[PDB]
């Protein structure tokens, strides 16, 4: 049971996504890829916006690029 | 003498920059604006240009906008 109760518990977790993936059948490229997409997007938006926002927005766009680091790290 | 000393050098400096302005009469925008343009491009470049060293090119591009930063405050 100790794996079995952990089984369904974590198994029920995909269901949430899956249930909502039933509702929205849609995808986003993982492995920090959508990060790097949203990175440049805000990374240029940093240079596209710029100001006290791009002060923050670059720092933002780094955490975007910080996600691909972790899994690779 | 010291003012006459620093006056000679800036004169000694200008004529050299003027003698090269005889040669290259391009006058490139100073006051950090050059830094910016280079910082923007090289950043745009580091985005695409390497697969790794985008570290240093933007870091380079960062050092560009530095000299601007210290004097605006």
From Swiss-Prot, chains A, B:
Compartments it resides in: Cytoplasm
Binding site for ADP: 31
Superkingdom of the source species: Eukaryota
SS bonds (residue pairs): none
Quaternary structure note: Component of the chaperonin-containing T-complex (TRiC), a hexadecamer composed of two identical back-to-back stacked rings enclosing a protein folding chamber. Each ring is made up of eight different subunits: TCP1/CCT1, CCT2, CCT3, CCT4, CCT5, CCT6A/CCT6, CCT7, CCT8. Interacts with PACRG. Interacts with FLCN. Interacts with DLEC1. Interacts with SVEP1.
Family, similarity comment: Belongs to the TCP-1 chaperonin family.
Function: Component of the chaperonin-containing T-complex (TRiC), a molecular chaperone complex that assists the folding of actin, tubulin and other proteins upon ATP hydrolysis. The TRiC complex mediates the folding of WRAP53/TCAB1, thereby regulating telomere maintenance. As part of the TRiC complex may play a role in the assembly of BBSome, a complex involved in ciliogenesis regulating transports vesicles to the cilia.
Record's protein name: T-complex protein 1 subunit beta
Source organism of the structure: Homo sapiens (Human)
Covered residues, full protein: 380 to 452 of 535
């Amino acid at each position: 049971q100790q794996i079995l109760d952990e089984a369904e518990r974590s198994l029920h977790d995909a269901l949430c996504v899956l249930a909502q993936t039933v509702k929205d059948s849609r995808t986003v490229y993982g492995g920090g890829c959508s990060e790097m997409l949203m990175a440049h997007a805000v990374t240029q938006l940093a240079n596209r916006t710029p100001g006290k926002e791009a002060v923050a927005m670059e720092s933002y766009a780094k955490a975007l690029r910080m996600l691909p680091t972790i899994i690779a790290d």
